[PDB]
Every structure is written in structure tokens, then in C-alpha cells.
Amino acid sequence: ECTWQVKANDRKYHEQPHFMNTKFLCIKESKYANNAIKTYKYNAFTFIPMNLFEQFKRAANLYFLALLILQAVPQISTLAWYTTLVPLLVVLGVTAIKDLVDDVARHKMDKEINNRTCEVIKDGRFKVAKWKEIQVGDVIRLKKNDFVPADILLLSSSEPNSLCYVETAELDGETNLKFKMSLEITDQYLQREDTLATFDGFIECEEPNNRLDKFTGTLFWRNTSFPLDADKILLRGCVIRNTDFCHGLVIFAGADTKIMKNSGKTRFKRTKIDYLMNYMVYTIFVVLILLSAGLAIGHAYWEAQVGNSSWYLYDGEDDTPSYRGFLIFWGYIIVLNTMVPISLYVSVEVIRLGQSHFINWDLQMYYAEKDTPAKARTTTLNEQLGQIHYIFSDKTGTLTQNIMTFKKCCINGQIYGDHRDASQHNHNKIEQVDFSWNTYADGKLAFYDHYLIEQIQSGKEPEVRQFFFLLAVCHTVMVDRTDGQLNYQAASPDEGALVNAARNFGFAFLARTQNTITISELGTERTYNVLAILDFNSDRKRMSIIVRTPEGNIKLYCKGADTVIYERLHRMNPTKQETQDALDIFANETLRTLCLCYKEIEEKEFTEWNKKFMAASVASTNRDEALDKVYEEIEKDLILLGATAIEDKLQDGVPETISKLAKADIKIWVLTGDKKETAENIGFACELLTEDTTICYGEDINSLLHARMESFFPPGGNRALIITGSWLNEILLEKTQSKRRLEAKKEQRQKNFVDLACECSAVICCRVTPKQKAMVVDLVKRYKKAITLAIGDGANDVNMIKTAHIGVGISGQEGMQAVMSSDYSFAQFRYLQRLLLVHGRWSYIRMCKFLRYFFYKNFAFTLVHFWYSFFNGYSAQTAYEDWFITLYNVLYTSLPVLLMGLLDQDVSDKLSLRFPGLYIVGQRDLLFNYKRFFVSLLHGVLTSMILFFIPLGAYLQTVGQDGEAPSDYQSFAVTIASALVITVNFQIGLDTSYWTFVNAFSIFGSIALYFGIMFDFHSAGIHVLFPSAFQFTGTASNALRQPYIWLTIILAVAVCLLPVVAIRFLSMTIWPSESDKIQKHRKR
Amino acid sequence: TRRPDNTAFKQQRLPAWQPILTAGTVLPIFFIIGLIFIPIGIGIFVTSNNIREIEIDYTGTEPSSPCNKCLSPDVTPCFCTINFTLEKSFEGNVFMYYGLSNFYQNHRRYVKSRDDSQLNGDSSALLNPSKECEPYRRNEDKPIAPCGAIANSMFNDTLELFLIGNDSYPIPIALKKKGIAWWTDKNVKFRNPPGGDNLEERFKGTTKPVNWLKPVYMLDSDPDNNGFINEDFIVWMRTAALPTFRKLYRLIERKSDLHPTLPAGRYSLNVTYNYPVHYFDGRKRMILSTISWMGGKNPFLGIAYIAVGSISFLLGVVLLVINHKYRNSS
Ligand SMILES: CCCCCCCCCCCCCCCCCC(=O)OC[C@H](COP(=O)(O)OC[C@H](N)C(=O)O)OC(=O)CCCCCCCCCCCCCCCCC
């Protein structure tokens, strides 16, 4: 509240003094969001600088930029034409087209978002208006089942009192209808089309605090301007029902109503393995710096001793030797650049981009009915799926499925049973016992118990008649016979099931217009009147009512609970215990229950208490607390009738999914804004918790932790936790001469909180705010730093579906909010069991194995130059052909890496699901870490030692028998190039463990192609019109002829390739891995 | 959206094959290798020790050396002579050829000092080479056609050998001077500039190399071996790979039927000393020996193969016993 003058009526009128955003450029725009919804990432004209700025956080890309700016210099270059451009451009361009294609959808999505076609008074009258027209502070005429433009007040409507309905299941998940009131004074003044057009009294209110609970401020209209609230204010996504048309003023509008100001703030998401890649690139960078420095020192000393001391090595410069040393210290930085190659950051892209398609081509993930694809969204985080620790879920919709389906109750204590539970209809199968006498049968439910249809249609006892009459009249639905049938304009989606069951169980319910109700006794019309409407109370958990028969009979009905009616009930019930003993049967299953009764008062106390009660009915404030006492005065001697049980169909396979994911040592927490009873019901209905679970609600945990401040609970595990948003906040405690100890006061209570929470095996949080959800997410993400996946249902959770390390959105339903803000998506819940067991660990092992071999195959390729430096006088002369040094990690050894990345699978997926104990390695990092990397390094370096020092010792003695193709330079390279190309391919052959025809095809193609081009490089048939690049013609076509050039390649291969076989076999036998244990006796 | 297509590839059920890698499979490879290296190793080591080799160290760096007298004879081409002796005569054909040491023929600033196009016989690169032979591209604005440090410094020395008779008659040895090259290089690698057989007027302006005391076209009267085809010229072109190396210099031919190619006794090596290595320890020498139907003299391969085979065999049994100990035990 800072004198906004929001101006809820006029169009622009721009009364705004010097208070707009005072920046330094004319791009200044309104303080009040008019209609703009700019949820883009950037603009399409100055995309480049922002994209590239956030692109060069890849240290490897900094490195490659340095290589280009370093190599093209016409001083020391030592390499061929600057042709790193071809792979350099790919890594920075294809990712760009990737996020262009994954971001451009926002344009169209918001365009269709910002068009609604409502009626709004932009001039004189309301007019057709797309959503992007309605400015800040206007007047909207909404229609039946509309789609709320802005969060506005309401001035009039169609209903009496201009009351309205909003289905608040958009900022939350439960779908009970919430009604609202309009402005009290103007309930009679304008209420119409025209006179509002002339209006004044423009109001201001408070800038949002994302609280949804205060809404202060007062009117600016005349006649003793009065305060502002939330009961006359509307929200964004609320859908409309039974409220044909309305009228109000717009206070908050644009893309900053409340939710755009509590939900959002995307971030660039990077997987865990990426951080390790960056660290290790830093380490290899510094290592090659030291190598180049030491070698340049060597070169300078050798030149001083021998450089000017020769004559055949005459240069055109008298540059001092130390200048040569400096001038060669930048000559190895370019022949040792194959450390940290460019090939890594291209092949990574193919790996990830391929694996995504495997995510979203899975038939077993393809839903049947809805025809939904289960498609990925990001196509870059595909390996995080193997390192999860905590899953955060929203009960609304995700676990349940918005269906109630009344199950059964008892009569005089006898249960209804399941399949037959009667004499007749017993030798047939379990098939339905036909309901046919019901004129409006249309049963969306099918029962199999039959004594409950024979006693109905026959009439053996009016106890059931009492039950069903109560189940009908004690409703709150707006029954109305509009179109042939009788319409049930529902209010609370709880009684609906029983009401419809009674409706099609003969007892069709009829009109209840004002005070008089009507109902069909087996179709026969009857009429009553309500003696007193006695509503529900949250504490009371009951709603009573009384009807009078036309001839002068009245009843009572409770519609209550057990621990609320088993105290005030009749004292002369023997059947109370049979009903109770059925009820406590109902506890070993997982559906909620209510208790139903009546009291026999006709006239002796009806009027006597009635006069006092009606006198107390009118009240300034004693209508809910003192009127309650006289209200509850007659609430004794409840002569009981029976009970009722309501189920809640939720999903499929969910208990099995929860079991499996518990096996894999994952912690699963449920966060939602729904109330406590539903939370407790789901606690058992999904088997997160059973007997032997000391729940110890928020009060208890607060008290005990305050006392204790092992893991600070009575040891024994299995302590599920139930928490209110208020009590969550209370325990978190966040509602000149600077000391600021509050954070010191906090930030341990948080640590103790999270430790308690982990030491409880489950956590349920009811009545929580969308801000609170992501808040606890990144709380627990800070302490005990882990990996988090958030699976969502709707719009309230979009704040936390975008904070965790991974976000998954359920699709195929109404879902369109998460499905655009997700990172993965699919159309069930049990499908999760395959995402993290078949795809997660497969992806993790594929990527780790690839990334671990891809450094060995480069180290064991580049260190040969370093070892050779000693015998060319530190001169930066390569040890390879130059039509080979460039094609090595392009064409020779590139395919098998990719095929093993994109095809290899540890064990068959089916038994992988059958054994969810394999997953743990991903969490514990038993495949990649800061140690296995150095092992790859130390295994490549030894291979270089061998590769160089075998042909060396071969070439210090004669090799030429009769053709005289002895040692020279152009042979000391071929006889080592061949050894290098053979060793690495044999190694990848050893690592892979899922052979296919295409794998072996690729490997043997690699070897065969290298030798084929070894020959065909030595034919001038292609050296024509190419006369200055294929120098190494006729070198190996001679060299390979003799035997001594062989019988050393085999020696090197053997000596460097057996010890890895020895280590593999040894460590396999002595310390088998889980996959080994499964695989050996895998038929068993 | 519609259902995904069906493909065993897309569903990852393609036919496969798992690793039958077992304690039973592993060991036979170790042991079959352990007995496949020793036979070849000894079979080649015997031949290695069955070759007779002799160096001479033509350099003679000490003052007592018989050739020190021509260390700095900057007056005339020293026609020096040394005596030596061999103990047992040879058979077959023999090769005689020189060798250097501490001569970094693989240096970077040096291996990149050739001009392949002009060597090939190109008309153009002839009258205008490529700017890479930096000190000497236009000494006085003329082509230097065999241009480059590699070609500049082809070492100049003439050797001859005699066998002394019973009346102090050192008769000459009939040594051949052809075929000692790659058959490829004398055919395609680089040829003379085209035209008729003169080699004189087709080298206009192509001045001699600075350190070449004489221009190429009188290198050898033989029509083939003059120009860019003088086979020794090529042999020096093919750069070696280390600071120590032998280049083929001349061959011999096995005499008619059976008698010693070179019966034992004293021999006289008379050589013109013309080349300055005495500054970088370049102890230049010549050697000479035979070649069998198996190979040269290379003990290192024999010893390496023997050691590797024995070690592989040795480790195999340890693997056997350890897997025996740890099978179905703990
Ligand atoms: C039965 C069904 C099976 C179906 C399977 C189908 C799978 C086939 C996919 C084939 C994709 C092939 C793409 C390229 C192949 C690999 C590329 C590659 O490996 O480049 C690696 C090399 C990197 O060399 P370096 O040593 O690090 O560089 C050192 C030095 N500085 C230098 O200058 O060297 O890079 C280079 O040295 C130069 C690059 C050479 C060529 C690279 C081209 C990359 C372009 C890829 C774009 C295509 C992607 C399009 C996807 C669709 C987009 C809509």
C-alpha cells in the first residue's frame, strides 16, 4: 500500500507522476503490466551475445578459442591449416539450434495464452477482446464457464447476492467448489450494464507478498469508503460454474498478478557429471602447461650446448637461445592439444541426443487409452536419471485420480460384502447383479452384492430406506430436474458418489428449491420442508438437518464421524457394537468412513429449544460460537443407524512402484496443499506406512527437537511425519549497531530439521504453499547435498517442478502447465519404475564407460610425442604422419565408441526390474569419480611407453634384409601408427559386453579401413590434381612387406594388452560386482 | 500423438552375445601364448648370434689415431689409409655401408627443409622453388635446384677396399654401385626435369648448392645416375629417425661357385676424408656384413620375446591356482 491509484476503471488516462522505472533509456515501460507476458528467454535479434556469453562457461570452449587465437599466428604454428574450425563450430552451433527449437514454442504458446475473446468496456460498452488487449485496471463482463483474465474484484453477477463459484483447483489440487461474495454496497446500485461506465473512486492496494492471506486496503468509492479483502477478490486460473455472468473491477493484471510473482525463475541446469568433466579438464590443462615448460627448458639448454655448436643446423637468425626456448614453449601447446580433444564435446552431443529418443520411443511407457507419447523435453540431462536420492510428489491428481466411487456400508451392523453376500445369485460368477428396475439406472458403479437389491425392490426393511433418505436429503448438491433427468449440480466432490448411488438406487432425489425439498420414494414423489439448516463445522465434522413430513412427522440426521458421534449417541444400542465391529473391520483396509444416525424428537422439545435457537439465529457476532452452544444443545441421545465407507481410486500399480523404489534406497516425500484427512488416508492407501509407525505430528516433533537441541529421536525408525504449513513455518521460524544473529539462531534448527526428516522413512506435508514446496526442496538440497527429482500434477507445483535437479510432469490429463515447464513427461505414475531402473542406470553406465575410455584413447595417442622429444632434440617434431594425426579421432577410432555408447546394456531390462538392487551404484558413484579418471590416465601413459619403446629398440638395430626398407622417419611412424590403431580397438572390444552385428561390423570396418587407406594413400591415382598434400606416398606399401616390421607390432599389442586381461579376470573373480553375481548364475 | 513404430532396434531387443569370459576361457590364451614366443624367440636369437659384424670407427678422435693427421687438413683431400683384419671368411652376398652418430637428422628445423615438387621434375618449381629453404633460396637470385639443408649437406666421402695378396699385392674389391635404394624412388618419387638427354641446358640458372663443390650434372657419367637420380643422393634424402643410423653405401656379389667371398686375413681400407663431424662428436664409421634368408642382426627382439613368453606362461599358472583357490570358497 503506497498510493498506487491502480485505476481499475479507466483505459489509460496516465495520471502517473514521476514514479515509473527511472532507468537510463527510453525502453522504460509501465510500472503496471498492461498485457505483456514475456516469458521468453531472450529476443530474436540480440540472441547471439547472450547465448554465447552463457555458452563460454565451458572451460573446454575457452580452451578451443585460445587454440584458434594461438595457432593462426604466422610465427610458430607447427601444424597445418587452421582446420579446427569444422568441429569447433559444431559444438557451439548445434546446441544453439537445439535450444532455439526447444524455446521457440513459447511464442505460439503465449500468443494463444493471450487471446481469450471476453467482453470488456474499453469504450461505452463491453466488447470482444483477446486476452492480450485488456489493460491494467479495467472492467470485465465474464460469462458462464469462463477463464479468468486477471485477479479482480467482483461488483455484480447473475446470482442473488451476485455470489459466484470458483473451482480453486489451479493454485492447489483439490476440487471442492469455493463460492465468493461481491461488493456489499453496490449489491443494488449498478448491478447492470450501463451506469458503471460512469464511475470513480479508483483504489490502490498492496504490492504482492505472495501470501494469499491479508489483502488490506479500503474502498475509494463514496458513502464511507470501506475496507478491502479476499472474499470479494478473484484469482487467475479459477474456472467458472453455475455463475452465468458477472461484473467487476481489475486490480492486478498483466503477467504479475500473484502467481507470476511467486512461480518461475528458470535456471540453466547442468548435470553432476559435467562438473567433474570441468574439474578434470582444469587438471589436464595445468599438467600440459608443466610439460611444455619443462620441455622448453630442455630445448633451450640443448640449443645452448649444441644448437649453435653445429653447422648443418644453420638458421637465418642470430636470435639468442633463450628466445628459441620461449619460442618453442608455445610450440608444444599445439602438438599436445590432443590432450582435451575437440572430439569429446561433439560425441557427447550425439550420445545424449540419441539417448533421449530411446526415452521417448518406449512402447511400454506408451499409455494405451489416452494415446500419449511419454516424450522427453530437455534432451540433455539424460544421465542424472541414474543418481537420484529424493523424489518429491504432489498427491493431487498424480497419486489419486479424481474419482470417489462409494463402496459400501452396513445396516443394523451387517456388512454389505463383496461378491455375493446373500443366498441367491451365488452359483453364478462374480459378475454384476443386475440393476434394472431403476428407471434412471445409468450406473457408473457396478456392485456384486445382491441382498441389497432384493431387499430394496421388495421392501423387507425400512432401515435401508432411512439410510438412503438421509444420504439424499443430508446433501448440499443443487439437484435440479432440468433436462429429462435430474441434474446434480455438485458442491463438494465427496457426497457425490453416495448421492448418485441413492439416485439410481430407486431413491431419485427431487427439487429442494428454497426451504421445501422433494424426493422420490422408489420413484413416487414426496415433499418435505426443512425445520432448520444446521451446517458443517471443521471441528464438529458433522452437518445435521430436520425435515417435516406433510402430515406432521419430523426426523433428525447427523452425518458424522466415530469419535464425534460415539459419545453423544443413544445409550440403549446393542447394535452399536456390531456396527463398530464392522467399522474396525473397515480399518484393515484403506477407505474413509462416516457415521449416520437420527434422534427422535417430534414436538416436546422441537419448539421449546427452537424458539431460543431462532432468537439466537440473528447475531452481531454470536452466530458461530454462542449460537453454536444452543445449536449443539439438542445434540444428545443420538439413536444410531449405521456407518458408511468411501474409497478413493488412485492409480494402477502404485503400491508396487512404491515398494520397488523403496528397495532402491530412495526417500519419497509427498507435498501438497490438501487437508489432513486425505493425507492420512493416502498414507495407508499407498503403503508408505502401516502399523509400527509412531507418527508424532508437528507438535510432537517440535517439542522433542526443542528438547534434544543418534539422530535425535527415540531410535526405531519408521516415524512418518505429518505437517501443517503453519507448523512447518513455526519450526523453521521464519514469519546502526549491527549484529544480526537471527541467521545464527536459524541455520542449525534447519540442519536439525533435515536430519530428523531423513531419520523418519517418510514425510507428508499437508496444506502447503507452492512457494513452500520448492523452498523445502532446495533446503534439503543445500544440507546433505543430493540429487532431487520432482514429479508434478498441475499448476501449483510448477514452482518446484523447476527447482529440483530433475522435473517430471504428468501429461495426458488436463495437464498443460507443467507439460510446458517440465523436463520430462509421461502419462502415468507406475511408468516411473522404468524411467529410473531401465533408463537411469543404463544411461549412467553407458556415459561413464564412454567418458572413461575416451580419455585413455587420447592420452595413449598424444604422449608418444612427449617421449619422442628426447631424440629429436626437443624440436617439436611430430612422431606421426600428418595425414594420420588429423584423421585419428575422426575416422579411425570413432564409431565403436559411439555404438557402445548408444547400444550397450548391462543386463536384460526385465530382470533389471526384477532386481532393483543394481541401482545403488549410481547414487554411490562406483563407476566415475576423481580416482578412476587418474587410473585411465595412468593406463594410457603406460601404453604410450610400450608403443614407443618397442619400435625404438627395434630400430636401434638393422631391420632391412634384402629390399632395404630400413628404419627411417617415414617408417618409425607407420610401425607405431599401426600398433596404436590396433591396441585401442582391441581395448574397446574388451570393454563392450553387449555384442551386435553392427558393433563387430564397425570395429572390423575401422581396422580394415585403416589398412586399406594405408595402401591406397600410396597410389598416385588420387594424388593427381592433388600434387602437394599426399607426400607420404609409397611408404608402407613397401614397409609392411618385410617380416621384422611385423613380429614387433604383435609384441607391443601383446605386452600392453595382456595385463589388462589379467587385471580384469583377477578383480572379477576376487571381488565380483553385483552384475557379476547376477550374470554368472543367471538361469538359476 | 500416434503410437511409436515397432523396431527391435528402437525397443533395444536386438540379438546379442554376452561375455563368456570365464576362468576356463581366460587361461588357455595365456598358456598358448607362453609357448608361442619361446620357439620364435630362440629361432631368431640363434640367427642373431649367427651373423658376423664389424665396425671400424673411421673417425679416430684420439691423438694416437692413424687418421688424426687429417682432422684439419684444410689443404688437400686427405687420401688416408687404415689396416684391419677379419678372422673367418663369409659366404653369400655382403653389404658395406656407413653410419653416423649424434647427428640429429630428425630435427624439426631440418626435416622441413625439402622441396618435393622441384625434386619430382616440375617445370615450374624448378625456376621458382617454394620459400622454405630459408638461408638459401636465392643466394644471388638463381635456383639451387637440389635445394634444402637435407640436400645441402649430403656427406661427401669416397671409400675403397683391397685384399692383400701373398706378395703384398692389395688387389681391389669389385664393388657394385647400383640398386641400393627403394625401387619406388628410382621410378616415381622424384625424377629429373623433362627433355632430351643433356642435363646441361635444362638447368639454366640453377646454380650449384653452396657446399656442393661440384654441380649435380657431373655426379656420375652413367645416364641414369646423374641428375636427381644419383642413387646415393636419394639414399641421403631418405632421412633417418634417430641420432644414430646406417645408410646403405655399396653392395658386393657372391663370387662364382663356392670360394670365400673375402677370405680371412688383413685388409686395407683407403678413403678420402672430406667431411666435418669432429665438432659434434659425430663418430662416423663404416661397417659391413652379410644377410641370411631370415633377417639382420637384432638380438633385442629375441630377448624381448623370450622374456615376454616366459612371463606370460609364469603368470598363467598363478591365475590358475588363485582361481582354483577362490572358486566357490569365499
Ligand atoms: C541401423 C540404424 C543405425 C543408425 C545409426 C546412425 C548414426 C550415424 C550418425 C553419424 C553422425 C556423424 C557426425 C560426425 C561424426 C563424428 C564427428 C567427430 O568425431 O569429430 C571429431 C573431430 C575432432 O577432432 P580433434 O582431434 O579433437 O581436433 C584436434 C585438432 N584441433 C583439429 O583441428 O582437428 O572432428 C574433426 O576433426 C572434424 C569434423 C569432421 C566431421 C564432423 C562433422 C560433425 C557434423 C555433425 C552434424 C550432423 C548432426 C545433425 C543432426 C540432425 C540435426 C537436426
- At A10, is the secondary structure helix, strand, or coil? coil
* Helix, strand, coil content of chain B in percent (nearest 5): 30, 15, 55
Specify burial of residue A161 (Cβ count, 10 A radius: 0-12, 13-18, 19+): exposed
Residue B22 has φ and ψ, to the nearest 5°, of: -145, 160
> Which chain B residues are within 8 Å of A1077, Cβ to Cβ?
none
How far apart, in Å, are the Cα atoms of A169 and each of A478, A488, A821?
Answer: 20, 20, 18
Bridge partner residues of A391 (DSSP): A668, A789
- Rounded to 5 degrees, what are φ and ψ at A931? -110, -45
Torsion angle of the four alpha carbons A780, A781, A785, A786, in this order, in degrees rounded to the nearest 10: 100
C-alpha span between A224 and A198 (Å, rounded): 19
Instruction: Report the candidate in B287, B294, B293, B290 with the shortest Cα–Cα distance to residue B260.
Output: B290
Residue A602, classed as helix, strand or coil, is coil
* Alpha-carbon gap, residue A750 to A756, rounded angstroms: 10
Identify whether the C-beta of residue A598 lies closer than 8 Å to the C-beta of residue A556: yes
Residues of A in contact with B248 (CB under 8 A): 960, 964, 966
Cα gap A578→B306, rounded to integer Å: 94
Which residue in the block uniquely carries the three cell numbers 541467521?
A743
Q: Which of A343, A379, A858 to mutate to test the pocket of ligand 1 (most atoms within 8 A of CB)?
A: A343
- Most informative mutation of A81, A90, A379, A999 for ligand 1 (most atoms within 8 A of CB): A90
Contact B41, B305 (CB under 8 A): yes
**3-class state of residue B16 by DSSP:** coil
Virtual torsion, Cα A82, A85, A87, A88, nearest 10 deg:
120
Q: Check: CB of residue A168 under 8 Å from CB of residue A396.
A: no
CA–CA dist A79, A72 (Å, integer): 9
How far is it, in rounded angstroms, from Cα B153 to Cα B156? Answer: 8
- For residue A515 the three cell numbers come to 426451504
Chain B, nearest residue to A314 by Cα: B135
Residue from A245, A14, A239, A48 nearest A135 by CA = A14
Dihedral sign computed on CA atoms, order A139, A143, A147, A152: positive
CB-CB contact of B126 with B227 (8 Å):
no
Angle value at C-alpha B22, between B18 and B28, nearest 5 degrees: 120
CA distances from A634 to A568, A573, A600, A630, A698 (A): 10, 19, 11, 7, 35
- Min Cα distance A1037 → chain B (Å) is 10
Q: Is A102 annotated as a binding residue?
A: no
| Sign of the CA dihedral running A449, A453, A456, A458 | negative
In angstroms, the CA A531 to CA A515 distance is 8
Interface contact B107-A873, CB threshold 8 A? yes
Write a three-state SS string for A713-730. CCCCCCCCEEEEHHHHHH
Q: Determine, for residues B299 and A957 on separate chains, whether the beta-carbon distance falls below 8 Å.
A: yes
**E-strand spans in A71-216?**
118-123, 125-129, 139-141, 151-152, 156-157, 164-167, 178-180
DSSP state, residue A638? B
Q: Is B251 on the interface with A (CB under 8 A)?
A: no
Give the whole-angstrom CA distance, residue B201 versus residue B196.
Answer: 10
CA distance A825 to A812: 9
DSSP, residue by residue, A967-1017: S-HHHHTHHHHHHHHHHHHHHHHHH--S--HHHHHHHHHHHHHHHHHHHHT
Kindly give the residue spans of alpha helices, DSSP state H, lying in A444-522.
451-458, 463-473, 496-504
Which of A975, A988, A967 minimizes the C-alpha distance to A1052?
A: A975
**CA atoms of A864 and A975, how far apart (whole Å):** 13
Regarding beta strands A806-810 and A788-792, do their DSSP bridges make them parallel or antiparallel, or are they unpaired? parallel
Å between B163 CA and nearest CA of chain A: 26
CA distance A865 to chain B (A): 13
Q: Please report how many Cα atoms fall inside a 13 Å half-sphere around the Cα of residue A145, on the Cβ side.
A: 0
**Rounded CA gap, A948 and B303, in Å?**
18
Give the integer Cα–Cα distance in Å for A816 and A399.
18
Fill in the amino acid letter for B277.
Answer: V
In one letter, which amino acid is B98?
Answer: Y
Beta strand pairing call for A763-766 and A721-724: parallel
- Which has the closest alpha carbon to A674: A794, A591, A791, A589? A794
Fold held by A375-400+652-735+742-830:
Rossmann fold (3.40.50)
Q: What is the 3-state secondary structure (H, E, C) of A60-96?
A: HHHHHHHHHHHHCCCCCCCCCCCCCHHHHHHHHHHHH
Residues of A annotated catalytic, as ranges: 394
Query: CB neighbours of A406 closer than 8 A, spacing ≥ 6?
Result: A445, A497, A498, A501, A644, A646, A647
Handedness of CA A86, A87, A89, A93 (dihedral sign): positive
Looking at the complex, report in whole angstroms how far the Cα of residue A454 sits from the nearest Cα belonging to chain B: 47
Chain position carrying cell 523435453? A377
Q: Experimentally, how was this structure solved?
A: cryo-EM
In the 8-state DSSP scheme, what is residue B4? P
Residue A260 CA to residue A799 CA, distance in Å, equals 10
3-class DSSP state of A641: strand
Torsion sign (Cα): A277, A282, A286, A292: positive
Residue to mutate among B32, B300, B328, with most A CBs inside 10 A, is B300
SS3 for A250? strand
In contact, B115 and B121? CB cutoff 8 Å: no
Angle at A445 between CA A684 and CA A406, to 5 degrees: 40
Round to whole Å and give the CA distance between A837 and A800.
23
DSSP assignment letter at A952: H
Three-state DSSP state, A918: coil
Q: Which of residues 322-361 of A touch B (CB under 8 A)?
A: 358, 360-361
- Phi, psi (degrees; rounded to nearest 5) at A721: -125, 135
Is residue A178 a contact partner of residue A212, using CB atoms and an 8 Å limit? no
Beta-bridge partners for B177? none
Contact A1020 B181 (CB under 8 A): no
Query: Could you say which of B103, B296, B305 has the minimum Cβ distance to residue A959?
Result: B296
Q: Are B193 and A1025 in contact (CB under 8 A)?
A: no
Element (H, E) at B285: strand B285-290
Tell me if A162 sits within 8 A of A253, measured CB to CB. no
- Kindly give the pairing relationship between strand A487-489 and strand A478-480: antiparallel
CA dihedral B286, B292, B296, B302 (to 10 degrees): -140
> Nearest-CA distance from A842 to chain B in Å?
12
Residues 6+ apart with CB under 8 A from A195: A189
CB atoms near residue A750 (< 10 Å): 17
Return the sign of the alpha-carbon dihedral for residues B22, B24, B25, B26.
positive
C-alpha span between A380 and A350 (Å, rounded): 10
Residue A138 assigned as binding residue: no
C-alpha gyration radius of chain B: 29
CA of residue A203 relative to chain centroid, distance = 40
Query: How many of the other CB atoms lie within 10 Å of CB of A692?
Result: 8
B285 bridge partner residues: B99
- A789 DSSP 8-state letter: E
Task: Kindly give the number of the ligand 1 atom that is closest to the alpha carbon of A85.
Answer: 33
Query: Which grid coordinates are listed for B221?
Result: 657419367
Nearest alpha carbon to residue B233 among B145, B173, B160, B161: B145
Confirm whether residue A793 is marked as ligand binding.
yes
Nearest residue by C-alpha to atom 35 in ligand 1: A87
A1020 contacts B188? CB cut-off 8 A: yes
First to last CA, chain B: 54
The identity of residue B291, as a single letter, is I
CATH 3.90.650.10 fits A1-31+114-261, yes or no: no
Strand partners, A178: A166
Closest to A877 (Cβ–Cβ): which among B23, B111, B304? B111
Nearest CA in chain B to A1034: B184
- Give me the residues paired with residue A546 across strands: A532
CB interface of A with B, residues 887-916, below 8 Å: 903, 905, 909
Q: What is the 8-class DSSP label of residue A299?
A: H
Q: Are B95 and B297 in contact (CB under 8 A)?
A: no
User: Known binder of ligand: residue A1011?
Assistant: no
What's the fold here for domain A410-603+638-646? Calcium-transporting ATPase, cytoplasmic domain N (3.40.1110)
- Within 10 angstroms of residue A942's Cβ, the number of other Cβ atoms is 14
Q: Which helix (H) or strand (E) holds B272?
A: strand B265-273
For ligand 1, the distance from its centroid to the CA atom of residue A843, given in whole angstroms, is 21
DSSP character string of A814-879: S--SHHHH-SEEES-STTHHHIIIIIHHHHHHHHHHHHHHHHHHHHHHHHHHHHHGGGGTT----S
Take residue B98 and report the three cell numbers written for it.
Answer: 656407413
Tell whether A767 is in a known binding site. Answer: yes
Whether the Cβ atoms of residue A967 and residue B240 lie closer than 8 Å to each other: yes
Cβ pair A365, A328 in contact under 8 A:
no
**Residue A770 and residue B226: Cα distance in Å, rounded?**
92
Smallest CA-to-CA distance from B199 within B237, B238, B229 is with: B229
Q: Are A962 and B117 within 8 A, CB to CB? A: no
Taking the Cβ of residue B325 and every Cβ of chain A, the question of whether any pair is shorter than 8 Å is answered with no
Q: Max CA-CA distance within chain B?
A: 108
The amino acid sitting at A762 is: A
The residue whose grid cell reads 553387449 is A994
What are A717's three cell numbers? 525408525
Rg from Cα positions in chain A: 39
Q: CB distance from B65 to chain A under 8 Å?
A: no
DSSP code per residue over B153-209: T----EEEEEEE-TTS-EEEP--B-SS-S-TTIIIII--PPSSSTTSSGGGTT-PPP
The DSSP string of A343-409 is SHHHHHHHHHHHHHHHHHT-GGGS-SSS-----BS-SS-TTGGGS--EEEE-HHHHTS-S-----B-
Query: In testing the pocket of ligand 1, which one of A288, A888, A889 has its CB within 8 Å of the most ligand atoms?
Result: A889
Interface of A with B in 46-105 (CB under 8 A): 78
State the Cα–Cα distance between residues A791 and B228, nearest whole angstrom: 78
Residues A349 and A91: their CA atoms lie apart, in Å, by: 8
User: What distances in angstroms separate CA A247 from CA A234, A258, A637, A656, one per listed residue?
Assistant: 12, 21, 49, 50
Q: Is B239 in CB contact (< 8 Å) with chain A?
A: yes
Contact A557, A544 (CB under 8 A): yes
* C-alpha grid cell, residue A843: 544411461
Backbone phi, psi, residue B102, to 5°:
55, 55
Backbone angles phi, psi at B106, to 5 degrees: -100, 10
**Boundaries of every domain in chain A:** 1-31+114-261, 375-400+652-735+742-830, 410-603+638-646, 844-1080
